Amino acid sequence: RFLKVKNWETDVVLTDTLHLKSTLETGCTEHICMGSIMLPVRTKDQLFPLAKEFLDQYYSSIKRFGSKAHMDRLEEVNKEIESTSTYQLKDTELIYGAKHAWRNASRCVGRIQWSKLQVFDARDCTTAHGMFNYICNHVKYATNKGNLRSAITIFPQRTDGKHDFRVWNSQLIRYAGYKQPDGSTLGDPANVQFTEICIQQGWKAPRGRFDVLPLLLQANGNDPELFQIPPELVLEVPIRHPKFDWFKDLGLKWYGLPAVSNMLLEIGGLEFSACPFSGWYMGTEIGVRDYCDNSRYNILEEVAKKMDLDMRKTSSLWKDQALVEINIAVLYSFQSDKVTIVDHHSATESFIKHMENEYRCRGGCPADWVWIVPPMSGSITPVFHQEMLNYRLTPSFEYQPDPWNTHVWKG
Amino acid sequence: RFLKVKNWETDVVLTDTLHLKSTLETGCTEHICMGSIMLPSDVRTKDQLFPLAKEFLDQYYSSIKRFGSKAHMDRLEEVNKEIESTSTYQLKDTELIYGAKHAWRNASRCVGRIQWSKLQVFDARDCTTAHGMFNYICNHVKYATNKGNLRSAITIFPQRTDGKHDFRVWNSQLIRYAGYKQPDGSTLGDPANVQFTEICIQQGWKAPRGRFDVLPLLLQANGNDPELFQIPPELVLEVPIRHPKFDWFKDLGLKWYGLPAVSNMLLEIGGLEFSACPFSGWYMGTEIGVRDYCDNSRYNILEEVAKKMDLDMRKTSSLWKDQALVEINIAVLYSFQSDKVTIVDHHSATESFIKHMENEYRCRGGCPADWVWIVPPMSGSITPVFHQEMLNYRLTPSFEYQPDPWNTHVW
Numbered sequence A: 001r002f003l004k005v006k007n008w009e010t011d012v013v014l015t016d017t018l019h020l021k022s023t024l025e026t027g028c029t030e031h032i033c034m035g036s037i038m039l040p041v042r043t044k045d046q047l048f049p050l051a052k053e054f055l056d057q058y059y060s061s062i063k064r065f066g067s068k069a070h071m072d073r074l075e076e077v078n079k080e081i082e083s084t085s086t087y088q089l090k091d092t093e094l095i096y097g098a099k100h101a102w103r104n105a106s107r108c109v110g111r112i113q114w115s116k117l118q119v120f121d122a123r124d125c126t127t128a129h130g131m132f133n134y135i136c137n138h139v140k141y142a143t144n145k146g147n148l149r150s151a152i153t154i155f156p157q158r159t160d161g162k163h164d165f166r167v168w169n170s171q172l173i174r175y176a177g178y179k180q181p182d183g184s185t186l187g188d189p190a191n192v193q194f195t196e197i198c199i200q201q202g203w204k205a206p207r208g209r210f211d212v213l214p215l216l217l218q219a220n221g222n223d224p225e226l227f228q229i230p231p232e233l234v235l236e237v238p239i240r241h242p243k244f245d246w247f248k249d250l251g252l253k254w255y256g257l258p259a260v261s262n263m264l265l266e267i268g269g270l271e272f273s274a275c276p277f278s279g280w281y282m283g284t285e286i287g288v289r290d291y292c293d294n295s296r297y298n299i300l301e302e303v304a305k306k307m308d309l310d311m312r313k314t315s316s317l318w319k320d321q322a323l324v325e326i327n328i329a330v331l332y333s334f335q336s337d338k339v340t341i342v343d344h345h346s347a348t349e350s351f352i353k354h355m356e357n358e359y360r361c362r363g364g365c366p367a368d369w370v371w372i373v374p375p376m377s378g379s380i381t382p383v384f385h386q387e388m389l390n391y392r393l394t395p396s397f398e399y400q401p402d403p404w405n406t407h408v409w410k411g
Numbered sequence B: 001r002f003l004k005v006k007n008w009e010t011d012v013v014l015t016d017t018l019h020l021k022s023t024l025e026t027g028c029t030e031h032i033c034m035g036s037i038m039l040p041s042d043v044r045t046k047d048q049l050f051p052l053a054k055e056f057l058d059q060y061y062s063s064i065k066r067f068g069s070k071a072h073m074d075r076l077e078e079v080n081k082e083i084e085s086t087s088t089y090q091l092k093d094t095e096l097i098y099g100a101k102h103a104w105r106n107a108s109r110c111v112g113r114i115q116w117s118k119l120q121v122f123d124a125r126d127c128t129t130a131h132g133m134f135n136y137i138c139n140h141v142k143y144a145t146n147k148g149n150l151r152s153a154i155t156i157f158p159q160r161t162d163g164k165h166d167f168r169v170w171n172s173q174l175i176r177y178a179g180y181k182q183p184d185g186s187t188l189g190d191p192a193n194v195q196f197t198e199i200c201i202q203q204g205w206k207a208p209r210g211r212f213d214v215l216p217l218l219l220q221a222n223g224n225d226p227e228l229f230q231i232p233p234e235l236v237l238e239v240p241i242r243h244p245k246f247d248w249f250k251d252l253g254l255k256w257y258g259l260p261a262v263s264n265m266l267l268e269i270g271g272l273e274f275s276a277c278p279f280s281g282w283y284m285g286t287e288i289g290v291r292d293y294c295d296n297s298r299y300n301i302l303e304e305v306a307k308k309m310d311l312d313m314r315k316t317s318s319l320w321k322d323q324a325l326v327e328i329n330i331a332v333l334y335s336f337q338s339d340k341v342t343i344v345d346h347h348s349a350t351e352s353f354i355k356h357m358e359n360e361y362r363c364r365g366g367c368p369a370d371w372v373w374i375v376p377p378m379s380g381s382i383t384p385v386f387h388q389e390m391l392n393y394r395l396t397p398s399f400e401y402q403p404d405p406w407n408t409h410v411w
């Protein structure tokens, strides 16, 4: 059963067979589309089919499907599951799985890069201090003095769900947020709740507008522990504008390394609850969302004010005009400091080339239009005009609840 | 099964029950989301028609608070007898107006629906000829235009009978600009209308072969060959496009028309199919300034505008496209406002839609909404609709797509 997607700007039509390999559910039905909904322990009963499916995919990809090595590995995993109730991936399988979870991430526009992921095996880690060390090395490797390198660090898998490894931070590097008694917020409003937890755990907050949060790390189900990333490892970029000299005086900076640390990596039915991964920024993530969301730093006002635009009526498009300038400044600053960044024109064009290649070589590329189209200038990027099919493939990155809502405190 | 939608900027959560009354299908399944597919998809037989009529009359009589009343049961019986007899049935004027207003109310891709109950419905079911169609359409255009104070309207021509006697407006909009492919290979005028512009010429029309030539109407009554008519120019309100800061802007020679009037859709009420039902409102500025002017497959003016602005067009990371895009859309709103022609900017329209959504959830239990179409094609995330989860589902009465008549017409 073939399915076609059309690019309405170029009339290129692509045919998707890969969706037939899709198992998990989308949230949609024949009668409702949940395409804009943000968020729509395993027993050995269901674990071996998940392992077998993954291992068939793995051995197919290495052109050894049905081989003796393939059949012996299936045997070995089968015996390990009934004996021990779980199983361990080989290093080769772990690397394959992590790369393919990125390849399958339908909301990620950066997937042309999926095969160049640096995978750090942290499954021998046992303590929060051990986690801190692995994360420091990840941050140093990925940052590479501004020449950013994609990487993932994979901590031990879930066992009984009572011994999880978790990074309580949503990203490895993020700025604190403080609610003031007068109702205003200092710093990043998105991080107020997590900041409060850190402070309660003993963090001494400097209470500034761009304070790097401490790492809050949980090993083996124990209470989490606070660690401060060495500041020499945290690369930051002061934001200035190439024509507007007053822009630097707004006091803005951002960190160079985007490293998401709250998602769950699923490979062959195994669940890796701590698996921070990092690449590099698309400019709009900072310039549109981080700076200009009303619920974030929300700087459209001051920027438009210092630009002296007509702010009395929205039909002057003063918001749109300040938005472009802020995003110019983000890109200019990162390029000037030689820190890797990509603009949304380049990134969406690369994605279209990636997508067509995946249709040719793989039979499809699952893609979430709602997330792939950039949050400014949508229709002047090529993905806007591109029809896309969204479906769930494994290996995958999944959401998981924030640990402070489920953790059982040891005290 | 009583679904919730969250606004992530305001944490406002609405509960949707209206979707459980959904009739038709979305194109999605639990295995695949087709939310970004443009078109996800002979007469009604005697059996299919009556349930459709019953469902519609049930909701009509509920709306006037006469569900289960004398008049309700009598109308149910009356239509029931007429279908058994004539194999179709005729709507009363009151039901026709209700059906048209609720087709708009149910149009999940329309951001302008806060206005849905203030629709002027012109009953043209007594029409028999293309000359008569032309007359009704001129009256529509003049009424809707209202010397620049635009008024929403629909004109409804006779309903499909056996599919051989169809009324159709061959134009996609009542007012659109011609498109000609040039000798050197480029395109003069509107490329989206090149095929239609040539059906008009290859049928009788003689073209000024300019850049903004108003197309003639191609009107089909009762299944006959369509006929060409020129709309009186005094009835076509146009706006010369200038910029409030850039005096060279007028030298680009751009204009657009004031009246957006879609004429190629099919209106479904109680199973009856109205294949000719042109409807009109007023423009959101981005429809002209982002899509009509800046799509690469349309007038595609971004290069020339940025050149006159002397922006650095050598790299995409200068965001020269984004900067020009904003200025172009500033000029469109400025020109319409200057000439006192109704227009709405994308900030005002999306704020109105959020208010409408709240109204519909409160008074009706929900509002079907297609995020992919509701979010404007520029500055997406600084409009409130970007952060609003939406549920998309199909309610009837409805506007539907239908094939272009030249691919169908028994010529």
Ligand code: HEM
Binding pocket: A098, A102, A105, A107, A108, A109, A110, A111, A113, A117, A150, A151, A152, A277, A278, A279, A280, A281, A282, A285, A342, A347, A371, A397
């Ligand atoms: C290399 C450059 C990369 C770029 C430019 C990039 C870009 C993006 C962007 C812009 C988003 C949308 C997020 C948002 O708007 O908040 C996203 C989502 C995502 N990225 Fe990438 N990314 C990159 C690398 C990676 C890597 C290395 C991984 C994992 C190994 C990854 C996994 C994901 C996932 C799983 C999502 C979706 C999260 C969800 O489902 O909600 N990305 N990416």
Ligand code: HEM
Binding pocket: B104, B107, B108, B109, B110, B111, B112, B113, B115, B119, B152, B153, B154, B279, B280, B281, B282, B283, B284, B287, B344, B349, B373, B399
């Ligand atoms: C009064 C001001 C109105 C505004 C500002 C408005 C705005 C819009 C916009 C921006 C779109 C997206 C279409 C595109 O991007 O090409 C749209 C779609 C649509 N509008 Fe409205 N509209 C208005 C009135 C109306 C009226 C009066 C009707 C019918 C009586 C209507 C029915 C529709 C339909 C049926 C669609 C698309 C449905 C589809 O493609 O499936 N609109 N509208």
Ligand SMILES: Cc1cc(N)nc2cc(-c3ccc(OCc4ccccn4)c(CN)c3)ccc12
Binding pocket: A038, A039, A258, A259, A260, A277, A278, A279, A280, A281, A282, A285
């Ligand atoms: C490796 C990499 C590079 C790069 N440039 N960007 C990346 C963005 C993400 C990513 C994913 C999901 C997100 O969603 C938050 C949410 C979801 C649901 C509900 C509420 N909030 C966010 C927002 N922080 C970011 C992940 C990795 C990235």
Ligand SMILES: Cc1cc(N)nc2cc(-c3ccc(OCc4ccccn4)c(CN)c3)ccc12
Binding pocket: B038, B039, B172, B260, B261, B262, B279, B280, B281, B282, B283, B284, B287
């Ligand atoms: C009343 C009113 C006012 C207003 N301001 N804008 C309106 C826009 C539309 C409307 C809907 C669907 C469309 O379809 C795109 C398409 C789909 C599939 C294939 C090709 N193209 C188009 C463009 N043709 C326009 C309808 C009514 C409007």
Ligand SMILES: C[C@H](O)[C@H](O)[C@H]1CNc2nc(N)[nH]c(=O)c2N1
Binding pocket: A035, A036, A037, A038, A370, A371, A372, B008, B386, B387, B388, B389, B390
């Ligand atoms: C409600 C809506 O789904 C939500 O705001 C989404 C829209 N698209 C997005 N797209 C990206 N890339 N990132 C986001 O956070 C969101 N948020």
Ligand SMILES: C[C@H](O)[C@H](O)[C@H]1CNc2nc(N)[nH]c(=O)c2N1
Binding pocket: A008, A384, A385, A386, A387, A388, B036, B037, B038, B372, B373, B374
């Ligand atoms: C491929 C994609 O579905 C297509 O480009 C859609 C996307 N969103 C849109 N949104 C609106 N309002 N109008 C459109 O024509 C489109 N086109």
Ligand SMILES: [Zn+2]
Binding pocket: A028, A032, A033, A034, A035, B028, B032, B033, B034, B035
């Ligand atoms: Zn869907």
